[PDB]
Every structure is written in structure tokens, then in C-alpha cells.
Design a protein around this ligand. Structure first.
Ligand SMILES: Nc1ncnc2c1ncn2[C@@H]1O[C@H](COP(=O)(O)OP(=O)(O)NP(=O)(O)O)[C@@H](O)[C@H]1O
Lengths: 422, 91, 91
């Protein structure tokens, strides 16, 4: 109903750019692409209609983080909408505020919601405000061994330190005794103060057999919030996602509906109005403990996208247009379960030494197309050279079938069909 | 040989029709010129060297020349070009 | 019977080396570039299509079979439109 979008520009690289270009071409919207000098041999450059260079004299990883160049290139090319992707400016409210001040549309939540998210304190307070139980532990950041000692004495003996200033694993070590406790705390504090910024640490209860379930949330500006479905990704080598399964493995209907209701209530209370992810945690006895809320679109969205046969990028574009959810004809009672899907990622890590990423030149490449097999090629082609400056993703593969063993067997055949030499 | 001829070309043809026809025939085959470097247009791409050609405001591309084969049977050579990330063979 | 149910719509197309201009006459030669266009609900079956392939003048002239599954007829029609636009087979 509002000002239609005539041009969309994106600030990521690899598979997200390709996906959004397909989405825009489906709606007949002109595409604008950006790239760095050290990254001039990809495919998304020739896929779009026009391409421009950024970060001419910057670092290869820092070239995509320079806001003013993106702002001016968007201003000069009459760009109306910009997509943030994930992993590049998506979780920094400064870019969103600058885009809003520049008169360009931003595909995503308001800067206020982003600022509310991010740091764990505000999200944790909002969680305890209404339902959605969180893991027991300290509230304020802990920097003293004494208060850590009382916190360990009160709750339980096995504890793990969780740090701030970065969502990565960093120094996640678990304390099981007393003698190692002091030395581990001192080492973690030294690493936080030296290798990182704020030495904010928190003491909590490490779950012996964790199981985390994700839920997607889609919102509009008319105060309508719809949950897509749940996700399980318990396969973690250390703390990173490896293999994704689309539906719940074995969840009680009461558990799944209660989790859905809690996620919807949290989204409504925060008033989220775009596509985001809500992360929880399930114990063997069963206790949904809040972890965090992702304000961007996750890379593992394709499983839910395939189960419900709903295109999320089209939904995001149309909701950024202004059209309400009923206009799109998307209703919570209009979606249903259809089959199962398994998601896997092709990396260039040596699977023997330490999962250490490898570098080289691809000599032989063939791909496997199957029945419920869908492929997303990032930079895989004949005579390609992979750079160590960025991540090491070749192909994102999704396998869909009527049953979990069926999808597993189909994916096994598909990977057996893949042929990468060099 | 007219598909989008404009009045400017109409007036140019009345000036020198023969060379206009020859120029149009040459341009149709080998493609759009005056996007190349002058030394590139006169001399050509030296082997094992990569250069850049600008086409439109965003359409920008790179070429690298690899090698040249020998005469096969009919006085034909094969040339291997390396585009942005791919390989093409031309005869 | 009870376990079989309709779910969505589908469109099927096949690419062929025939000239739609004169007489749908088949064409033979060597392919110089091939690219894929698989997407969200796009299924592709490649019979014989690779860089530098040669098309025999006496066998079948089928290259690729493309299929779209979507929620509605216009959706799948648009997916075929975009996928066919993305495909590039030159020469
Ligand atoms: N059983 C557990 N008990 C307490 N904390 C845990 C437990 N398991 C995992 N955590 C934390 O869960 C986190 C998962 O790691 P990681 O996936 O890298 O964070 P993340 O979700 O990506 N954060 P972000 O980047 O903001 O999205 C690690 O810090 C783990 O230490």
C-alpha cells in the first residue's frame, strides 16, 4: 500500500547475495552488488545487474565494514532498499540508524530493537520480566573470585564461565573441582582483560546433556506476529552448528505448543516486527531456559522454508513494502507440516588434525542433483581459488524426504555424488 | 542491416555509404569496440598477463590469456581465456 | 489411496538445440559456456551439458530438463521465467 521499491542493494557476499538476487529477480527489482578488490573473482558480481567496488584501500575483512562508502554508493545509484544479510553489519544498530537518516529503507528491525538486543543484560531482564525462564546464575557481570565462590556454593559445583564482548566461544571452560577453579578463573580473567575488552564474566549451571530448539518469528508493522516452526541443531563439534534437522526430533505436543506460545509472547512484548530467531534450551527432564534472540535471518532457515513451502525472502520484502500479513494470505492456521529436511554445509577444514581450514585451488568439480535435493553454490566452479580471509563455505545442501531415514539416505547418496578434487 | 538505426546513422550513411556498410558489418561480428585500451586494441593481450575491460557503469570484467594451441587440421588455432573465474576456448 | 494427496503445482520444460526462427530445425556444434540456475523450488536434470561438450548431429538433442514446484500456477510460472533467464548457453 506504500511506496513501492524499485532497487535493492545488499552488503554481504556468497550465498545470501545469490538468494536475494533470485528473490528480487522474481519480483522484477533491479539489483545492486558490492565487492572488495581482493574478492573480485566470485559469481555474485556477474549475477547482479550492476557492481561497484568498496574498501579500495582497506583490509579484506574490514572493507565490508566501512559504512560511509556503502552509504555514498547507495546514495549515488538511486538505491531505495538495502538488505543487511547476516555476519556483516546486521547486528550493529549504527548502520541501521545511518541508513534511516540517509532516507534509504533497511530490510530489518528498527535500531531501537537492535540496541535492546545484543548485550545480554537487557534481553535477560526482558526475559525475566514475563515468563520464559532463564538459566539460574549471576545477574551483574562477575570479576571477583570471591563472589564466584558464593555463586558456586549456592547453585551447584559444576559451573562454566560465560564472557561478554563477542558471541563466539572464546574461553568456555567448565569447572568441576576447587583446586583448578582458581587457576581457571585467573586464566579466563587474564584472557578477557588482555585478548579482549570488557572482562565481564558470568557464573551459571552447565547443563550435562543440553538440547537447544530454535523458533522463527515473522512480524509486521501492524502488530501481527507469526511463528514459522521449530528447529533442532544439537550437532555441535565444539559450539558450532554442523548438521541441521528441520522438525523436532522427539518433542511432546504440550512442550512444542508451550514453547511456541512463549516465543510468540516474547516477540509481542518486545514487539518484534521482522524475521528473527528465538533460541532456547531443553534438559533431559525438560526445562525451557532462555538463551538469546537473534534479530537477523539465520543461515539454517532453509529447512523451515522447505517444510512449510513458504518463501521467507518474499515475505520480508513484502512486509518491508508495507503490506500486512493477511494481504499476503499467511495465517498460522494456513500452514502445515509436510515431510522432513536435513541441512549440511560443505567446508574446507581438514577433518583429521583439528578441523583446521584448508586453502587451495579447485581442479575437478561436479555436483549432485537429486529428488528432494537442493543445492546452493557459493563459490564452487571449475578453476576456483578459495581465500583464507573469509569463511570456507563451498555448497549449502538441503535434502527433503517423507521420513528422517529417507532424507538421510538421499543426502548420503547426494554427498557420494559430489566430486571435489584439488 | 538495420535493427535500431537512428537518424544520426541515417545521415552518416549518406556521407559515405560503402565505408558505413563495412564498418557496420565489422562491428556486428567482432563486437563493441572503444572499451579497450589503445595498446590493447593495437597490440593485443600479452600472454600470462591479466587486464581489465570496462563496459557499463557496473558491468566490469577481467581477462587473462593462458596459451595458444597449434594448427589442428584446417589452419585453426585454439586459445584459452580465463574470465572472472572460468575458462573459455575459442577457435 | 488415502496416503496420496495433492500438494501444490508443477511445471516441466526441456531445453533443446533447435532454431525457433526458421523451421524448428535442430542445430549442432560445440558449447562454449554452460551455467546452472538451480534455486528454491527448482529441480534440474542434466543429461549432457558441460563446458566444451559436442552435440552429435544424429542422436537426441535434449540438453536439460527443468521443473518447478510451487504453491500456485503463477508462482511456478515466475520461477520458470527467472530460472530460464538465469541459464546461459552460448555458441
Ligand atoms: N550446557 C550449557 N550451559 C551453560 N551455557 C552453555 C551451555 N551450552 C552452551 N552454553 C553456551 O552456548 C554457547 C553456544 O556457543 P555459540 O554458538 O558460539 O554462541 P552464539 O549462539 O553463536 N552467540 P551469537 O553470536 O550472539 O549468536 C557457548 O558460549 C556455550 O558455552
Amino acid at each position: 500500500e506504500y511506496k513501492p521499491i524499485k532497487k535493492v542493494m545488499v552488503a554481504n557476499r556468497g550465498e545470501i547475495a545469490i538468494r536475494v538476487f533470485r528473490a528480487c529477480t522474481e519480483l522484477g527489482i533491479r539489483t545492486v552488488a558490492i565487492y572488495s578488490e581482493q574478492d573480485t573473482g566470485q559469481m555474485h558480481r556477474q549475477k547482479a545487474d550492476e557492481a561497484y567496488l568498496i574498501g579500495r584501500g582497506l583490509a579484506p575483512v574490514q572493507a565490508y565494514l566501512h559504512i560511509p562508502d556503502i552509504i555514498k554508493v547507495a546514495k549515488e545509484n538511486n538505491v531505495d532498499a538495502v538488505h543487511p544479510g547476516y555476519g556483516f553489519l546486521s547486528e550493529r544498530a549504527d548502520f541501521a540508524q545511518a541508513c534511516q537518516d540517509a532516507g534509504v529503507r533497511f530490510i530489518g528491525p528498527s535500531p531501537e530493537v537492535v540496541r535492546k538486543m545484543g548485550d545480554k543484560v537487557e534481553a535477560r531482564a526482558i526475559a525475566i520480566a514475563a515468563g520464559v525462564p532463564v538459566v539460574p546464575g549471576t545477574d551483574a557481570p562477575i570479576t571477583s573470585l570471591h563472589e564466584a565462590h558464593e555463586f558456586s556454593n549456592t547453585y551447584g559445583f559444576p559451573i562454566i564461565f560465560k564472557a561478554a564482548y563477542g558471541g563466539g566461544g572464546r574461553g568456555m571452560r567448565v569447572v568441576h573441582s576447587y583446586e583448578e577453579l582458581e587457576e581457571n578463573y585467573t586464566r579466563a580473567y587474564s584472557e578477557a582483560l588482555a585478548a579482549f575488552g570488557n572482562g565481564a564474566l558470568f557464573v551459571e549451571k552447565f547443563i550435562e546433556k543440553p538440547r537447544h530448539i530454535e523458533v522463527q518469528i515473522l512480524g509486521d508493522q501492524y502488530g501481527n506476529i507469526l511463528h514459522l516452526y521449530e528447529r533442532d541443531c544439537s550437532i555441535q563439534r565444539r559450539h558450532q552448528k554442523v548438521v541441521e534437522i528441520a522438525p523436532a526430533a522427539h518433542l511432546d505436543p504440550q512442550l512444542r505448543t508451550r514453547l511456541t506460545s512463549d516465543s510468540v509472547k516474547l516477540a509481542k512484548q518486545v514487539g518484534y516486527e521482522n524475521a528473527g530467531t528465538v533460541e532456547f534450551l531443553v534438559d533431559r527432564h525438560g526445562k525451557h531456559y532462555f538463551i538469546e534472540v537473534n534479530s537477523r535471518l539465520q543461515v539454517e532457515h532453509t529447512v523451515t522454508e522447505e517444510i512449510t513451502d513458504v518463501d521467507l525472502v518474499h515475505a520480508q520484502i513484502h512486509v518491508a513494502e508495507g503490506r500486512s500479513l493477511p494481504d499476503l494470505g499467511l495465517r498460522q492456521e494456513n500452514i502445515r507440516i509436510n515431510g522432513c529436511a536435513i541441512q549440511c554445509r560443505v567446508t574446507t577444514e581438514d577433518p583429521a588434525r583439528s578441523f583446521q581450514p584448508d586453502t587451495g585451488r579447485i581442479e575437478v568439480f561436479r555436483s549432485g542433483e537429486g529428488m528432494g535435493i537442493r543445492l546452493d553454490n557459493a563459490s564452487a566452479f571449475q578453476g576456483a581459488v578459495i581465500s583464507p580471509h573469509y569463511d570456507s563455505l563451498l555448497v549449502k545442501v538441503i535434502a527433503h524426504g517423507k521420513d528422517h531415514p529417507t532424507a538421510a539416505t538421499k543426502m548420503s547418496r547426494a554427498l557420494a555424488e559430489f566430486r571435489v578434487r584439488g | 542491416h538495420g535493427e535500431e538505426v537512428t537518424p544520426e546513422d541515417v545521415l552518416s550513411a549518406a556521407m559515405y555509404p560503402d565505408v558505413f556498410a563495412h564498418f557496420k558489418d565489422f562491428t556486428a561480428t567482432f563486437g563493441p569496440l572503444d572499451s579497450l585500451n589503445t595498446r590493447l586494441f593495437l597490440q593485443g593481450p600479452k600472454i600470462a598477463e591479466e587486464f581489465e575491460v570496462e563496459l557499463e557503469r557496473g558491468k566490469t570484467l577481467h581477462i587473462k590469456a593462458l596459451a595458444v594451441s597449434d594448427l589442428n587440421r584446417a589452419g585453426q588455432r585454439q586459445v584459452f581465456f580465463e574470465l572472472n573465474g572460468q575458462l573459455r576456448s575459442i577457435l
